[PDB]
């Protein structure tokens, strides 16, 4: 049978940041991945 191959899903990692001058609680952005994969 014929199996499709896909390279491992991956992407860049980005950081939300209000700024140290305001707070330090931040939020992460994962690029171009379905969330169900972390």
């Amino acid at each position: 049978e014929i199996l499709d191959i896909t390279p491992c899903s991956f992407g860049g990692v980005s950081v939300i940041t209000p700024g140290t001058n305001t707070s330090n609680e931040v939020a992460v952005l994962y690029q171009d991945v379905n969330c169900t994969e972390v």
Binding site: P7, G11, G12, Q31, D32
Partner: peptide, 21 residues
């Protein structure tokens, strides 16, 4: 009218359904 290996493709910030506004 207009038509893998670490090469990411970032989406544009503005979406057409905004540009069309």
């Amino acid at each position: 009218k207009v038509t893998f290996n670490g090469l990411t493709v970032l989406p544009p910030l503005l979406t057409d359904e905004m540009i069309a506004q």
